[PDB]
Ligand binder design. Sequence first.
Ligand SMILES: [Hg+2]
Ligand SMILES: [Hg+2]
Length: 259
Amino acid sequence: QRHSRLILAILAGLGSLLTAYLTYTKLTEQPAAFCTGSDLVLSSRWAEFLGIPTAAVGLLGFLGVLALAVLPLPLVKRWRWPALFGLVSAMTAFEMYMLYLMVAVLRQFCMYCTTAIILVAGLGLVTVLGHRWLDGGKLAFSYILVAFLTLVTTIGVYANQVPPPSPLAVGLAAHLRQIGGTMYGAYWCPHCQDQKELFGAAFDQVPYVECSPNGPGTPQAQECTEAGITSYPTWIINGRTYTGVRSLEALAVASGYPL
Ligand SMILES: [Hg+2]
Ligand SMILES: [Hg+2]
């Protein structure tokens, strides 16, 4: 109701728990190549960061705030209320990029993902509202520092996630072009993107049939059903149908390209 850091502690609970959940989800997942048709944006790319699940990155942060909201008072007097600023600010930086992706690049809504953000959104709004240097503008800057320092790392670490496209990719793309080799799949599907990852620069050459232009759970485009496509990144290469992400390695086998 008024001036209370316990309100942080609570929101850190919910943050922690939800975050712990999706961690246990991605960790227990039974992996797949096709994605015929819990959530898709949730097990997109990005959801895995630096080794650990992004949920886990979320975890470290969320219980990291919980502890500081609760651990005080000797051992760390001066340091806890700003350390509690630096972590929440850094979470806000990360929230914004996730939110960005969600809205802008993935274009799909994820209700676990929105929750997490709303939670952090709140984690700031409360953390903002302490006595806070008789309201200094040192925040304004301090925030802009930490926010921006994070968005160079986060955006950095995500762009360094995708590996430099294989040497094979260039030829295998322009070959599949020749021998009619076609990839049927949905733009939304994490794996139709997974396959598109492996080719990279080269993918612009690869014969691609988009199957579901208008989102998930809406009629699959006509070209696809006529070729009997039932899952999402299937390959029709010379009468033979490969149902699932294949390596550049294995597509070169299936397509006659000498590896
Ligand atoms: Hg060829
Ligand atoms: Hg695709």
